[PDB]
Amino acid sequence: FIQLRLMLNKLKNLDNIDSLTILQPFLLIVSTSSISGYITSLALDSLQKFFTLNIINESSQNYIGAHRATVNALTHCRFEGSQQLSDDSVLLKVVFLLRSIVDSPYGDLLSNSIIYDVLQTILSLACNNRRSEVLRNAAQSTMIAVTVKIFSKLKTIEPVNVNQIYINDESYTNDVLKADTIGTAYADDNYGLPVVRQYLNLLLSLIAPENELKHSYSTRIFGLELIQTALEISGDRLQLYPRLFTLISDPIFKSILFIIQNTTKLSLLQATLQLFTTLVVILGNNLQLQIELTLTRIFSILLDKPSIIKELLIEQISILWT
Amino acid sequence: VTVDPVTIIIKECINLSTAMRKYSDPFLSGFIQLRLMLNKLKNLDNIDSLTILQPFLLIVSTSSISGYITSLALDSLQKFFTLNIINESSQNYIGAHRATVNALTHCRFEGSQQLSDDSVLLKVVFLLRSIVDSPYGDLLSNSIIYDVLQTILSLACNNRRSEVLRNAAQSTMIAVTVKIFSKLKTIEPVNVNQIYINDESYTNDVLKADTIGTAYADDNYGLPVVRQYLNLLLSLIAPENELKHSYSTRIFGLELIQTALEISGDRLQLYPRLFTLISDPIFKSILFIIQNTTKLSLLQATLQLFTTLVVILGNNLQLQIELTLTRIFSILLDKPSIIKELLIEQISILWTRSPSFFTSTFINFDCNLDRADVSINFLKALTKLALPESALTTTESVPPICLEGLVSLVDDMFDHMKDIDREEFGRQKNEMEILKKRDRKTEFIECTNAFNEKPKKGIPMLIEKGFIASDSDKDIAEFLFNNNNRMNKKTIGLLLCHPDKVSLLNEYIRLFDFSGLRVDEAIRILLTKFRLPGESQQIERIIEAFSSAYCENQDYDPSKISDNAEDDISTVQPDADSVFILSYSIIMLNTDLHNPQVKEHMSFEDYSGNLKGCCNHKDFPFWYLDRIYCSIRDKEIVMPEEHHGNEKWFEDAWNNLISSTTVITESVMDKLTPLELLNFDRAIFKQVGPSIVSTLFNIYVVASDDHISTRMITSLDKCSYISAFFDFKDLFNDILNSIAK
Amino acid sequence: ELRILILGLDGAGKTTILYRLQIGEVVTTKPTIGFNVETLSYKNLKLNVWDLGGLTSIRPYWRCYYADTAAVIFVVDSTDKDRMSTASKELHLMLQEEELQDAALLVFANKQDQPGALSASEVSKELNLVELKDRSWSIVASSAIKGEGITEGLDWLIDVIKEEQ
Amino acid sequence: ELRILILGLDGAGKTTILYRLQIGEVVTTKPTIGFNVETLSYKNLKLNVWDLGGLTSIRPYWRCYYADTAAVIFVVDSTDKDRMSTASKELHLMLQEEELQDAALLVFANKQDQPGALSASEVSKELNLVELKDRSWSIVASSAIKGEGITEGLDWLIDVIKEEQ
Ligand SMILES: Nc1nc2c(ncn2[C@@H]2O[C@H](COP(=O)(O)OP(=O)(O)OP(=O)(O)O)[C@@H](O)[C@H]2O)c(=O)[nH]1
Ligand SMILES: Nc1nc2c(ncn2[C@@H]2O[C@H](COP(=O)(O)OP(=O)(O)OP(=O)(O)O)[C@@H](O)[C@H]2O)c(=O)[nH]1
């Protein structure tokens, strides 16, 4: 800090000064452990002030790298403390700064690995039962905003090829949600399809029959809501991208059918039926065998269970023929 | 957004209806009606958005539903806003968004324990932040934005809520403040060339209670909400409500003001109301906190705001900066050590972050007479604090900072000397008139003291020793008009009214500007720089002169429009005695409405009554009497030389020194050649050179680290070069002889 | 034990009428968008009064509130004669709603105390109030800022409510 | 309680050296932006090691990190010798620091496996290590993926540390 002050003393503007040099002490004191909660809170406040008042911008050296380093520091924010309210406040600052960065052009200039790390961090916060409630709600809101931004950016990239034939050879069991270590085309490019594919694979991992007992009901409902928001933002353009459509068709519809057929919880069934009817309305001309099988199973259920399941099914299917 | 919005709205209606049915009547019926209405549709071509949003808004605003149903409604509205269901191309979208913000501001529910309440209020805060940040927030109104500001600020300044909710509210406040003042950055300047009379009252916007939980308004928001927001922020940090706000609230208000200044910049000068709020009361509160506080965090926030003001708006806050710096130097040279360390560091932020701080201060102050010496006093204080003797009994971190300041002065002086061609600098034979008049400052102080004790001796002294062109009445009037910052103003009142001086009085009063102003503003500008005498005849003479001048300087026309006119130029034409009577009425109403000793007040009734028959023997129009009455009820007439002594003294000092000069509102480095800059450097070096050289030698001798010694020897080398350049033979000999020894 | 509904177009002083009934004062009220509910203890009987906004975007929401309604106060606006046709159409829709049939209709027209005020007989005939059948029908002109007629209308309403039981 | 400061430009392989010291297994290394600390002990003395990265924006903080340091490692990428002059200038500046007078300039010429690896003698001559003011000169080649000179360099460092006292 003292050296940065000496470097910046009596300089009219940050013309030749590299932005990463400006931000490095703050990022170092954010990412490293053994630094108390108060100091990392102050550092996060300083970073947020430097972002709300645009300081590292299009006319500064290594601004792409500066914002990438800021996000990399944020995704590994670790600190010590005595109470839990301080931890919640620091993590709320982290989540807010991430939401600000991603929803800006400088967020659009980030990397595939960086965006995937942001997704994993915020999802770990939003699916951890050991945090508070306000922190989890903030994390969930941030996840919904980031999902909307990512799939909106999806609706500008042309498909890789419209004449070639896609063969499903990429495995689904590759991405699993990581532990919450925060608190106490290829990568290195402007993010595009690869991060979208990884994100959809992670969302599939949240809601899957093989991963049923390793996730709570809240996590699965949140994953279904995220997939539904992704579909609603994206639209009928998801069929031009073969990998995203395969993930929607085979595994995600398998998960929807499994939950519809073998679940007793009402909230999970409601989320699953909402996603199913959204899929039928939006992408129904390309998913016919799946809709046939799901409708046949639903009619089997209705014509043979405290009957509140049946009322839920009949309402969420009635949304169809209107 | 390519999906049909109808299915989203119907799905939200279905989920809310199911939730209400499970929890458990009019609200459920409204949702069923909306479901049917939208089911019999295919697109939102001619269905108003308010109808689509109304059941959700009722759930949000009605204080008879659980937090679960309210949270569901908030989630539905956030889903609509994220998906942009109410687009630019939808009917009544402005009304829909204004209604949804109104519903959020008055959100109420009867809920479970505090966790659910915090979750719901967080949802409200997030939705407000999203709406304001979008252009749909740019289409909101002044009243709606003020309600948003009040709600978020009350949440952020409430000690009965979770820290997470408070932090979220604080972040939202910072974002909204940035948005508002960024809009201010590019709107328009109104009445650039028209003078401003300070009539607004600073005590009309107070923070409301935290009731959430358990041009003009109705127009796109612009300047009015910015003014109201600055007024509320002033109320947070005001001196007169220290007991009503915690320290966290005051710190947050200071941070909000600083963020607003950083976002706006040097454009608050164009807007007179905002700059008046920044100049008089906000700076008054800053100085009060600096002088009369004991907590370090509040002092740090106050000093940071003060230095931001000095860096940005320093060319228009000169008297305030002089007063605050003088108080700071009085503090630093007489409070625990930690306070002094905080002051010296946050003031150290100045001389590094200014083009040439000491030179600019010496140009503005210490040369313009009637202003106390600030640059020389600053340098002397820094030199006295730099020695280890001042390190004793104070903080150990002060002397290095003061030494940094002195070395910065030397380095800046050297930088103004890189390529000046010393021979050509000496070639000058005509010294600047500024320095020539500066050398005679002590004589001016003696003459001003003589004038204060008795004008009969002051005037001949003020004409014999210069400082006045000639003994003519016009010259005396001009000098009293302009140069009165240190001249006593009660003496001006008692001299400008003595019967023999009826010529100087007439010229002085004619020297004002009164074109286009009502009687209220004319009286404000007359009493701004002139204290009324005590005797009735003296006040009569001054008021007679003022009335004559106001009528002569406001040439009227026979139009004589009566009533139905908010104009104030061609509408009222008081001849000469009408002005006399109205001015006496204004002066009396000032005391009547602002004397707390007298019970009750003189209302408008019979105040309009015992005035009819003056303006050509008729009554003044309703607009004029109402306007003067309001302008006296608010913003009591500022007068000079209130009273000096014990008890309330800071208020009097601020009134006399700043509020008198801030009633009417209308750098130099870029305007001077390098040679003039070096001339000012020569003057300041002559004044403060031996002290700096001696201080550097003391530090160098007593030091032990190599870096300190190297830096001090380099500074002494630069001092030797400066001495050689300006031909300061004694100082050059001193420096080199001490180095040789 | 009574549910009095105040319905009318925007600008009829419905909120002012409600506040004058509740406390008896002139209160400046902004244009409401949802609803406001207060109670009255004018007689030994305690009645709960629901006030609804009058904008074009909320009238179907009025249509939702018609449940266990004992009386309806259809305050009308005594100016802007071009809006009288729309007011009459809305009144006919409310009357033919098949739920408010077993109620009593009362009209105030509080805008009589202004220049160009329409005659009570004139508006009653123009609004086809005489075409009403099998329902109580009585209008009482009044001034919201002053009053006088408000007490008369409330007296008639409470008398007919007593006669109902 | 020994202090070891692993410096060197980007791509030199400092993280690989630290990983080989700590676990003796080759692990993929991401470009470091801050620092890595893994206190170790070779035989009987604790080895607190601080690793610093390049990226051409952290060298001022390299200067900041010099504090109570007796061991200095200056791994220089043997491949791409155009950047070697910058490393020479940086190590000269590090030596010129007053707080590292009692240090021991040790350099590992890593990436010997890559083609065209510069000769150790020529590299040391380009570093003009003979101009050191009687501090040290321990240019020892090594490899990161495989252990060729890492053990010898560690032996040299621990031997000079033992010879200190
Ligand atoms: N001068 C005058 N104005 C009245 C009177 N009664 C009502 N008003 C007007 O009514 C306005 C108050 O609004 P509301 O009482 O809410 O009118 P409303 O019929 O309920 O319609 P909404 O505003 O949409 O709720 C005031 O601004 C007055 O202008 C009256 O007796 N005299
Ligand atoms: N295969 C092989 N690779 C080596 C060898 N020495 C160095 N490397 C390369 O050096 C890299 C080591 O990364 P780091 O030590 O983190 O590089 P750094 O000094 O931290 O600089 P940055 O990566 O920019 O932070 C590896 O990715 C290797 O590719 C070696 O001996 N064999």
Tab-separated table of C-alpha atoms and ligand atoms in Angstrom, chain D residues 8-16 29-32 53-55 110-111 113-114 143-145, ligand 2:
chain	number	residue	atom	x	y	z
D	8	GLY	CA	11.800	-15.176	-10.784
D	9	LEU	CA	9.973	-14.089	-13.917
D	10	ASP	CA	6.811	-15.597	-15.368
D	11	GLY	CA	7.153	-19.077	-16.825
D	12	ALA	CA	10.388	-19.780	-14.944
D	13	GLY	CA	8.799	-22.639	-13.007
D	14	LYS	CA	8.821	-21.386	-9.424
D	15	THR	CA	5.502	-23.037	-8.556
D	16	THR	CA	6.739	-26.349	-9.970
D	29	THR	CA	0.430	-24.962	-11.954
D	30	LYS	CA	-1.864	-22.030	-12.650
D	31	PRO	CA	-0.281	-18.600	-13.244
D	32	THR	CA	0.164	-17.163	-9.769
D	53	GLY	CA	4.993	-14.412	-9.498
D	54	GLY	CA	5.637	-12.241	-12.520
D	55	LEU	CA	2.977	-10.910	-14.920
D	110	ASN	CA	15.464	-24.534	-15.320
D	111	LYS	CA	13.808	-25.902	-18.482
D	113	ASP	CA	14.771	-30.412	-21.091
D	114	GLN	CA	13.477	-27.952	-23.686
D	143	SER	CA	14.900	-29.562	-14.153
D	144	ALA	CA	11.366	-29.088	-12.840
D	145	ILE	CA	9.482	-32.177	-14.035
E	2	LIG	N1	7.817	-29.911	-18.687
E	2	LIG	C1	8.468	-28.967	-18.015
E	2	LIG	N2	7.887	-27.728	-17.831
E	2	LIG	C2	8.535	-26.752	-17.147
E	2	LIG	C3	9.799	-27.003	-16.629
E	2	LIG	N3	10.226	-25.889	-16.001
E	2	LIG	C4	9.272	-24.940	-16.110
E	2	LIG	N4	8.210	-25.456	-16.805
E	2	LIG	C5	6.985	-24.692	-17.125
E	2	LIG	O1	6.824	-23.688	-16.141
E	2	LIG	C6	5.488	-23.597	-15.691
E	2	LIG	C7	5.485	-23.343	-14.191
E	2	LIG	O2	4.494	-22.409	-13.830
E	2	LIG	P1	4.810	-21.318	-12.691
E	2	LIG	O3	5.958	-21.791	-11.835
E	2	LIG	O4	3.573	-21.077	-11.861
E	2	LIG	O5	5.253	-19.985	-13.474
E	2	LIG	P2	5.409	-18.594	-12.676
E	2	LIG	O6	6.860	-18.323	-12.358
E	2	LIG	O7	4.584	-18.614	-11.415
E	2	LIG	O8	4.834	-17.477	-13.678
E	2	LIG	P3	3.259	-17.410	-13.994
E	2	LIG	O9	2.779	-18.761	-14.464
E	2	LIG	O10	2.993	-16.375	-15.060
E	2	LIG	O11	2.541	-17.024	-12.722
E	2	LIG	C8	4.840	-24.928	-16.023
E	2	LIG	O12	3.542	-24.736	-16.536
E	2	LIG	C9	5.733	-25.554	-17.074
E	2	LIG	O13	5.086	-25.538	-18.326
E	2	LIG	C10	10.392	-28.244	-16.808
E	2	LIG	O14	11.511	-28.464	-16.348
E	2	LIG	N5	9.723	-29.226	-17.504
